[PDB]
Amino acid sequence: GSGSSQCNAGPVQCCNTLTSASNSQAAGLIQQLGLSGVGANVPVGINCNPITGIGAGSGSSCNANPACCDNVYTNGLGVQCNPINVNL
Numbered sequence: 001g002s003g004s005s006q007c008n009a010g011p012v013q014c015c016n017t018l019t020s021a022s023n024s025q026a027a028g029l030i031q032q033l034g035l036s037g038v039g040a041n042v043p044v045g046i047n048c049n050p051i052t053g054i055g056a057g058s059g060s061s062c063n064a065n066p067a068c069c070d071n072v073y074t075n076g077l078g079v080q081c082n083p084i085n086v087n088l
Contacts (some may be wrong), residue, residue, distance in 0.1 A: 003052045003060035006084055007068030011052065014062030015045030016076075018083055029077035038079055045069050045078030061086045 004011035019026060022040035029046070030038055038044070045067045054060050066086050069078035 001054060003054040004050065005060065006066075009068050009070050009080070010072070011050040012060060012062075012084065013045050013048040013067045013069050013072055013078055013081060014051045015065045015067050015078060015081060016047035018043070018045055018065040018067055018081055020044065021079075026077065029073075029075050030079075032075055033073050033077060035077075035079065042079065043067075043069075043081045045072065045076075045081030047076040048072050048078040048081065049076065057086070 021038040021042040021044045025046045026044040066084035067081035070080035072078040
C-alpha cells in the first residue's frame with residue numbers, strides 16, 4: 001500500500017490550507033507557476049504534499065487538510081483540491 005487509496009484525480013494530498021484560488025496564498029502560488037484558467041471559485045490546496053507516509057494519524061491522513069487535486073505543483077500548489085473525508 002502506498003497510502004493513496006483515496007482521490008481518483010491522483011494521489012492523496014495534505015494541504016496546509018484548503019481554500020479558493022481567490023486566496024492570496026493560492027494566487028501567489030498560481031501566479032508563481034503561471035497558471036491560467038483558475039478562477040476565484042476554483043478549489044486549491046495550499047502547500048500540499050502527497051500523503052504517502054502510512055502511519056500519520058489513523059493511517060493515511062493529513063494533520064492539516066487532506067484533499068484530492070487535479071494537479072499539484074512542487075511549490076505545493078494544488079488545483080481543484082476537494083476535501084477528503086477523514087472522520088468528517
